[PDB]
Design a protein around this ligand. Sequence first.
Ligand code: ZN
Lengths: 87, 87, 136, 99, 96, 100, 244
Amino acid sequence: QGYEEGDNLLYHETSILDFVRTEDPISMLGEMNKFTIDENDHEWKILKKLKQTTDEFRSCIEDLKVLGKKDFKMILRWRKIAREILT
Amino acid sequence: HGHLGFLPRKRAASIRARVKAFPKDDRSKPVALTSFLGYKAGMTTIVRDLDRPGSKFHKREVVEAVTVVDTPPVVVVGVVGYVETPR
Amino acid sequence: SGNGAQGTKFRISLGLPVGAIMNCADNSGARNLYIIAVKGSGSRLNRLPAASLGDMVMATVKKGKPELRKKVMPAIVVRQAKSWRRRDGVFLYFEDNAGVIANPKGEMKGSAITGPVGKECADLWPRVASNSGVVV
Amino acid sequence: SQSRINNVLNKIHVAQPQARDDVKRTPFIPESVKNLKKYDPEDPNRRKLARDIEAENGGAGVFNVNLKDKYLLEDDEWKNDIMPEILDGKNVYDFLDPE
Amino acid sequence: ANGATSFDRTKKTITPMGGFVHYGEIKNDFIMVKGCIPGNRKRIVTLRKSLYTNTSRKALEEVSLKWIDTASKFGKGRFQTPAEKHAFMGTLKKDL
Amino acid sequence: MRIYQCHFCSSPCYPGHGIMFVRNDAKEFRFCRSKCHKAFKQRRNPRKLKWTKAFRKAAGKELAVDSTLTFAQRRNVPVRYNRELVATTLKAMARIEEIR
Amino acid sequence: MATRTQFENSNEIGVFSKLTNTYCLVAVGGSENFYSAFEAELGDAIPIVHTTIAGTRIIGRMTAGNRRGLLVPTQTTDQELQHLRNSLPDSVKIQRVEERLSALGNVICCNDYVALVHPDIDRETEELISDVLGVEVFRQTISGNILVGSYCSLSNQGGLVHPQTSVQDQEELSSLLQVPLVAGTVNRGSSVVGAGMVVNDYLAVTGLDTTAPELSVIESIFRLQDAQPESISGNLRDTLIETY
RNA sequence: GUGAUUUCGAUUAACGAGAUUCCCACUGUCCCUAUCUA
Ligand SMILES: [Zn+2]
């Protein structure tokens, strides 16, 4: 059905913080390719010392359109934990 | 349908196909065999570094299917003379 | 290879018969391209003409702008889902089927192409090569 | 006609820079390019061109130019050498590096 | 080094891993011919000299081979030699 | 030529072998065989599939970081051809594979 | 030094060749007429390399660089990288980049001191440009056109952009580049100008269909003749007005 | 003799192994065949 007018590279990346803070994550996960990581950001410095941040979370985050629904649900759980931390 | 020059579509009289024309002889050249016998032993693939001026694949490498024919040396065991006749 | 192409074109597996709708990958304002004919197509009885990567077809715009609709125009196929063999040794394929509008001389109507363009199409059409951002 | 005047400007107008500080951006012309003698198409003693070499050897479509002849190497005998690339499932170029 | 070229330094013969299917290894002289020929494996074949002096540049051009595929033909072969297969997989249970 | 490695299981990909998929974001996934290609299309996780080098290195079946393993990378800066350098490379490759 | 030629009867010299001040890259295909056309003017002064990029001939579109360095896409093979390295002198850096926008000639419009790049390229390739080519990177769309390298031919002396460029865009780009700019055509009215012609500070090559007025404009902006300054617009003006 | 009912000879909801033109979805009907089991 064609391509977007404002989309040149057909590449959509946002911030893991933007994912954490957005209210509707379903459409974002549908229309994102990657979640970039900043190691000089204090929120990410906080979230680096968590149980689910390490292991295969980074590999599942570096790409999105190869993931399965189980990987996506794990990502949703990680964002949920990050949200909870945030007379 | 079909190429009418390959009729009739009958079984070959032998398993070894006959050579029905040898190269035209040139008496000045040294003595050489015109033909050899081998056994077909499978196929494989090669990468050829092509040198073919004029081609779009000049100075480029292509992948080719090849056939391997097992050819141990043949043993000479006889000689037969032929005379030409009006028949 | 018709008029406008650069040199000889080798055989590539056919993916897009007549009556197929592909994406339009340029910024000309078309959304799809419906194939009505394939240029340089040898005739065989009871066979649908089909197009491959690097081919020039004649297409209408089923979805797009009202000005661009209703008119048969030349297009060039730049992506095919059907896998084809590259002579250096790879079988490869793209995610969808995509083409770009063009004039009879092979010049691109739009300004740029979005997505990867087939290497064969880019090396055959210099204007496609000029307007490509990603070539495989 | 005054209406045609507005269309002239877009093509005839040439815009200069504002010189943006003292950063020097001078045109580079090589000394060999400077001292190169102009090629005269009808001149007896002129350098032999690549198409001339092709015509002398085979002509277009049959001549086979050696692309290793203009290689700049520490040794000239190395120009006609095969560079290996596969060894036991490894790419040689991957292991190729100084020290 | 039947299957080794100037570009591929792996010392290996022409025989693919596991042998040709329905035909053993090649331990004699052999002819590698471009393309396919009539017949199937094990069939006796006759190779004849060209009947005419070929006027094609194809008959003249030298062949420089870069690599010969010696992967197994008995499946989706990934390794050219058993040494490469072992170096990839590593140490298996029966190696210890 | 170039020996690639499978995007799924990391097994070597030789000329003609396997299949390549080019995604719209223009990155190329090379698969050594249709097994890996079909698992990718099914969207299975190689890090979960025990028969892949990704899983093995993730779970500790084999070493992921090593002095021998640092020798081979994709060189993006070419070096001038030097016969002595090539011969030294050919020796060192065998030595390194033995040590590994 | 403005000359005309064709590659296999094609007018797009910028597609099939790359010209800088210290080297020239020429597609290998066909015969040696194109190579010898370059060599007749250039002499043995600078390297002229028959090169192939990923098995293709579109090297002025797949490759980017200037007198200092050369950039090739990820699709470039090791053999081609080695061939380029053995051909060019060590004074030329040669770098292969992992950029998703592979058509470096299209996505980078550069010269010896400043690069105009595609807006959406990444910081990694911007840093690579600034490091290997020794230039300053600017994300800018020429008249709102993707592929600045395709729609603009640039040099240390001047620049030719596609005619649709607005006057404000011309002024802004001229200030960012510090070379005089002209909106103009090539190859009898072709908008794609960088991909239609190669140019460096002392030579320009364009398709055989380049008309005399277009050739004069090109030679004026690129300052090929020593005697003619940037001010000859006041002397070509009558011809240009009569043409348009 | 007409065949529900209503409204203005026309009109009418519900229903139909009744008739006709298209749409989505789907596909070996087809391009163009190929293979497996009994
Ligand atoms: Zn697998």
